[PDB]
Amino acid sequence: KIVKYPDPILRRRSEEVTNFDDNLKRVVRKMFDIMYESKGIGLSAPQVNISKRIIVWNALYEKRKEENERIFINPSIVEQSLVKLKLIEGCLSFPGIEGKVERPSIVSISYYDINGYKHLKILKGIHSRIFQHEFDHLNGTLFIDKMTQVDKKKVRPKLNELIRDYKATHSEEPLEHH
Ligand SMILES: [Co+2]
DSSP states (O other): OOOOTTOGGGGSOOBOOOOOSHHHHHHHHHHHHHHHHTTOSEEEGGGGTOOBOEEEEETTGGGOOTTSEEEEEEEEEEEEOSOEEEEEEEETTEEEEEEEEEEESEEEEEEEOTTSOEEEEEEEHHHHHHHHHHHHHHTTOOTTSSBOHHHHHTTHHHHHHHHHHHHTTSOSSSSSOO
């Protein structure tokens, strides 16, 4: 189940994986599932209601494919370029909400694979973009924290819209409208 703003889980600090077993492969499996089915480019584990530090993505989910899939367990950003850029970013937790965000172009990361083994890699361009989006998710950061002042405003209606919907959870009482 794909979660949405402002579930308060999206704001909790995700925990390190410790057991790199089969269970995990399935959790990761189901993670990709939701992703492909929700027309989304990346996805992190809190985004499907799991407070664990997992990130996955696909540059070309237009045509879902093996090993075109990228997986990162317990990531860490160890250096970032000084060169920044703003691109339009979206989020499967904010449907129909889009804005420009400023992030470093390139990132030096460390992470652990599905099996437990550490890895050092340099991500640039799209991969860099998707990485920092999903990584923010693991620390309780949402891209509306980093959004420009202009786009943050230009999108308040929508954001507020989403808070309504969500309040229709403990809404068996009519004091929450539509
Ligand atoms: Co997101």
